[PDB]
RNA sequence: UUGACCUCAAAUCAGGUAGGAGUACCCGCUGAACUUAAGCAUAUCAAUAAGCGGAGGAAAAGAAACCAACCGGGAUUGC
RNA sequence: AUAUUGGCGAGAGACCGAUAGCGAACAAGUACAGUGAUGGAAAGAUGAAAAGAACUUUGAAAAGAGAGUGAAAAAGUACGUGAAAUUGUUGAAAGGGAAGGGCAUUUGAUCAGACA
RNA sequence: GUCGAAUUUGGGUAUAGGGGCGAAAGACUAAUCGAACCAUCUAGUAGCUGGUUCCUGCCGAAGUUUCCCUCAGGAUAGCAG
RNA sequence: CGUGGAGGUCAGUGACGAAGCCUAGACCGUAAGGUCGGGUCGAACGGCCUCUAGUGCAGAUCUUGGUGGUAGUAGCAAAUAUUCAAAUGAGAACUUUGAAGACUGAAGUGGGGAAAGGUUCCACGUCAACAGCAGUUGGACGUGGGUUAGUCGAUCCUAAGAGAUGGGGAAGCUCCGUUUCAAAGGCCUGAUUUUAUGCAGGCCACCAUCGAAAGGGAAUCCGGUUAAGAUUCCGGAACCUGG
RNA sequence: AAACUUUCAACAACGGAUCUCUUGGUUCUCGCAUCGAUGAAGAACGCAGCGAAAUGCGAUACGUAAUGUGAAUUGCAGAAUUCCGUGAAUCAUCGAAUCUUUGAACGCACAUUGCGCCCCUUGGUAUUCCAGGGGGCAUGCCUGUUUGAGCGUCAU
């Protein structure tokens, strides 16, 4: 109470918080999501 | 490759030669370090010339035989019959060398006029704490010069 | 930087997969393990040439050709036709080879000089010049090029006696001595012609 | 213009230099010319600012507007005045955040240190 | 299983904390640090590192002592009481 | 572990009190530029290895 | 909130007896801390600390100072710090020595003054 | 019996010093191959990179057992 | 005298201008991956000033609609302008196993020019 | 299939790359082995594949000779501007 | 023709709206492209003579970023199994309680632990995100509390082994070796307090050190207690070591 | 015929291009020479009235002393005329100090917050036992002091 916020703006500050807590997530995971699924050594079992 | 009448010409980058390239943009900037170098030592040597006094030499070739030029020094013998010693002359602007010896007269009799000229020319100061200063010239080979016979 | 682009350990994977065959970073846990490198096409790789710090800055020129330009660029002064083409307003003035009195060169302020420019006729260069500062085009501005004046009246010396201190601050005159003649201050922009204010003392050097 | 080595003619130093600057040179930075009466009675054109200095508004919105200052804001580069201030919609008021170059100093808030700054800079009493 | 299965027998560690260093590069069986060898007087590097002679090199840390001598030169290593 | 030695006790102490949001109060200084904590850690994603 | 013009004066028992109160203040405040939220004189205490004992160490410094004084060796702590190669350096005499024949030489043949001029 | 000498040791003896970091430049050792040769092995890349040792604000070199074959020059360094 | 892609301090550029330029304009050798050696990112802009939407009302709440601040919310922290792919609503038009195009004209829509 | 033994197994420990270990399959050596992984030399070379960015105008071919460890390539004369 | 920047020039345009962007609205040019009107928007930008380049993309299994059709599709199908009422709440197939039915069936879906993880433990509050449906629930989010040892273990010993010294090698980073070809060391009486040693008064010839929370090993039990700790705390009753 | 599909425009969306900006780089130039056993570089941990970072710092802990400046810090709370002054301040300057555990790292060791020894001192009935506080114990090498060895060697 004293430092700044109170319990509405914590209310109000957590929420948009959150949300850029999350953008970022769904940024990492779309620059990510092409190599990924990367192999260095995969094996395709199938010859015959 | 080899394609038509064009000079053979050699051209040694082969090696790494970018890692090892030399560009003189500082030629403007060092000419002016140089500059205030002369200039500070001027200073630092108030009345005193820069230079020493050197002495006229034949250029050693068939080719420059005929171009007498700066040498680094004048021979005992020379100062010896300027009337001074190799200890004083150094102190005062006059260079010394040990290792020419003189076998021509010619030059003889002209390095010792160029030392006979200078210690009438020169101005010396007692050694002391406050000694006097009267003026500062710089170039002591360009007012007793080297001209050719 | 001799080392942009390459700073990174990346060989290629090559055929089999389904990607170019271009180098490709290596690893794991972040965006660019995999990504392209090495290249001109690449984001974060090099560029084709990079620019090298040797290559010819200054140009040499024979010093005849210099001195030939520069006694051409001294004669156009003397023509109002390309005087007057170049920008410079003398459509008042007595005569083009402009020469004043060399106590020019003698006096200190700068309200006393602009006093003189101003009853040898020069008022309107001047007006041009400090009604044409305009701003820079472009990223030139965050250079250290922000302004643009046009060009004014070059006044000519032969001792400089606090005349180049007064018009030091007045914008776009220059001054030189008629011995250390610049071209560039004679043709600028290639343009033959510019108001020169001679002292007679400097027309007279001249010959 | 410029003929020193010392000094540069670079923006972006120049602007580095403006805001990161410490609180010692925006004291100097936030100086605040005075008005003509004072301009006689003690011989200068322009100080520094400090609290409880009272003023006068040249430019702006608020222009006219008199006041005493409430508080200097040198890391904002603002001055604070009171009777000057915008009823935000609440109620509240909040006052407004000025620039001292857009003021002029009616009545100085004098101190040792100032009276002496004042017969350095050729001042009076 | 060479794979998922051999991922699974992964419970004991080959390496941990360096007391030069900080980081989990100290092999144990042989007591060795793989970026600083600790034991070793000098520490690791080759000039074909030149990323990892940024990653530890001076600068990167607090430079205690060493921030202040550029300072302390300029003044001469002067010495004794400020002034009046 | 359960049986474990101190240097470790001492780390996991440190990620423990690293383990908390932003305070509210710096998102209200006057020229700021941090809106949440981005060096964040928790058990399931990211194993901090020690 | 104290200040070292007026500690300075004071004896080693008096800061001594200053110092063991001071702790007690910080002890109350680190009660009175956990009952309340903001506790501010905490600070001033724990700053005013430390202006006693750097009171007390450069007052128990002067006193070995001036009682190495006039010796060849004093400790460390009291020493110079200039850099290790300013200290495993010459000194001034060192370097300033000469072999007679030199001294003799330049005592003779010192370095003239002169000047180009008839 | 004792006192010397020489040599070798010990001491938490008095006083000191060296070690490591950095390393663009510098001094030495050690030392490659890709490459070029339209093949390749001598060769070249290269008396390079890498590895090692060691200093400074510059280092190194330096006042001739030198250049030369001149009517002879005159430490070294650099352009 | 010479060297100097390192360190300390200064001055400048016909240089890059946030996929560029140092890998890093920002809490970057950071987060993160790997046993380890090592690898190694992304990410700048509200506005002059937070004046950062008091208050009313529906709603479980987010939020919405009114109000209001502002020069401007077609600047509401997902905030400079705000392109394209892609998408919704509206309006016009056509449409038998493709669509689109070229020449020529009808019909419709729009523009033209007054030659007052 | 084998299931009291040439058994199974944790932890500690030794062996490290032209080297280890191998009841031997060229098998295993951190999803990697007829020679691991990391960085550097390294923008390795490529007579070989792929691509190579604005308009109009004027002129406009060759696949043929000779030599080449030459035959998916160069030099050479020709053609062309 | 066009693009980024440079020198001259139009005393060039511009907050009375520059640049940029949209415009099956207009003009010029064969064309590259240029110009105009409208809307949007908000601070710098152009024509001309010349200089200069990191100067013009439909392509490169191109680089980075982003977005689509397929597609509300494949599909969310092992582990025998769920149901009724009530309470809570904005809201309940999934939360809580109760009743029923059933499973693991003691080589377990129980009770503890080693590695490893690191606060996931417990409580209060809470639902934007996570729990590939839901969610009032939670190993999630927010704030906080929480791990008590003379006896358990580490610590101590040594195994396989690792590794300094002295020494010897190596251009050198470092290697061999581990008692070796070393002058490798403390400990006790008289001397009774000077305790420094005269002798003493002789004792192997040793001679680093690290290395096992499963080997060796000095000593502990019951009951009770907490939201979460206990062979640790409380109470009682005991033991070992060193003094 | 509507739905549907396609094309164009307006408005709204997704997305973050262009335009403008720039406490950043890059390159050139000039000047200077300044790490460490007086314990460096680097690391671990911790420190603020409310901070996880970055920056600063070390149990004297976003700092103390001193010097200059001469009234702020400001996100909030707290301080407040000491403000015509030995004096504000995340100020600047910096010459006095502090400088945890470490690290060449130095008592031995270190995957241990492990185990010692000497001196002074205090307490417990205590030169010996336990604990607390303060200060020391590395190796190679040199100059010198002290002690000692060797039928190596001299004189007696
Ligand atoms: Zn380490």
Redesign the pocket.
Known sequence: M???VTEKQ?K?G???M????????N??I??????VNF?????DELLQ | ?????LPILKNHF??????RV?????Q???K???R??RATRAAKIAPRPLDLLR?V??????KY??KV?????FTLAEVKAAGLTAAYARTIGIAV????????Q??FDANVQRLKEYQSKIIVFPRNGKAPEAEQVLSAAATFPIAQP | ???????????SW?????????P????????????????????????????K?WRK?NVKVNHNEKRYATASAIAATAVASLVLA????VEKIPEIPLVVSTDLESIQKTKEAVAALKAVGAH??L???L??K????????????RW?????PLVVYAEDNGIVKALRNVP?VETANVASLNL?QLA????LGRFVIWTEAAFTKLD | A?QS?????????A??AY??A??????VLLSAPLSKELRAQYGIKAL?????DEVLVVRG?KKGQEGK????????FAV?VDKVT?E????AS?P??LHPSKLVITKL?????????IQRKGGKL | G???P??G???????????????????????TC??????????????????????????????????????????????????? | ???????????????????????Q??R??????????????????????? | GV????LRTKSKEQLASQLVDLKKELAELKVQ?LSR???????TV??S???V??????QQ?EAV?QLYKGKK?QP?????????????ALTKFEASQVTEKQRKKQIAFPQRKYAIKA
């Open positions: 004293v430092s700044g914590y109000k957590m929420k948009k959150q949300q850029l807590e999350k953008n970022a997530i940024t990492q779309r620059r990510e999501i092409k190599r192999q260095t050594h995969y094996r | 490759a080899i394609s038509k009448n082969r090696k790494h030669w970018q890692e030399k560009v003189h943009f500082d403007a900037g060092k002016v370090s140089r205030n170098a002495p030499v034949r250029a050693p070739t068939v035989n005929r030029r700066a040498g680094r020094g060398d040990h290792r020419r010896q003189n076998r021509n010619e030059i | 930087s001799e080392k942009a682009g390459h700073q990174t350990s990346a060989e090559g055929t089999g997969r389904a990607v170019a065959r271009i490709r970073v290596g690893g794991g846990g972040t965006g660019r393990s995999g990504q392209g490198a090495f290249g001109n096409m690449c984001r974060g790789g090099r560029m084709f040439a990079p620019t710090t800055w170049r920008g410079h307003r309107s260069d007006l041009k010049v009604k044409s305009k701003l820079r085009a472009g990223k030139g501005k965050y250079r250290n090029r643009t004046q046009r060009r004014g776009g560039l600028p922009g290639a343009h | 410029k080595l010392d000094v540069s003619s670079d923006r972006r130093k602007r580095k805001f990161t410490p609180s010692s040179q925006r004291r520094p600012i400090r609290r409880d919105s200052i409430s508080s200097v804001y040198r890391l904002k604070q915008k935000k919609v609440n109620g909040v407004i955040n808030h004098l101190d040792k240190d100032r009276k002496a700054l | 060479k794979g998922t051999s991922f027998k992964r419970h004991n560690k080959s390496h941990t904390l360096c007391n030069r260093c900080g980081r989990r590069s100290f092999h144990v069986q042989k007591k793989s970026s600083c060898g600790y034991p070793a007087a000098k520490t690791r590097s080759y000039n074909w590192g030149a990323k990892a002679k940024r990653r530890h090199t001076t600068g990167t840390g607090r430079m205690r002592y060493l921030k202040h001598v550029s300072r302390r030169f300029k003044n001469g290593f002067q010495t004794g009481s400020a002034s009046k | 572990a359960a049986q474990k030695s101190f240097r470790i006790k001492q780390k996991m102490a440190k990620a423990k009190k690293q383990n908390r949001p932003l305070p109060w710096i209200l200084r006057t020229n700021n530029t941090i809106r949440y904590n981005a060096k964040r850690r928790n058990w399931r994603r990211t194993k901090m290895n020690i | 200040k070292a013009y007026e801390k939220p903001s506790l501010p004189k905490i600070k724990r700053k600390i430390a202006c004992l750097t009171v007390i160490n450069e410094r100072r060796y460390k702590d009291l020493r110079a710090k200039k850099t290790r190669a300013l200290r495993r």
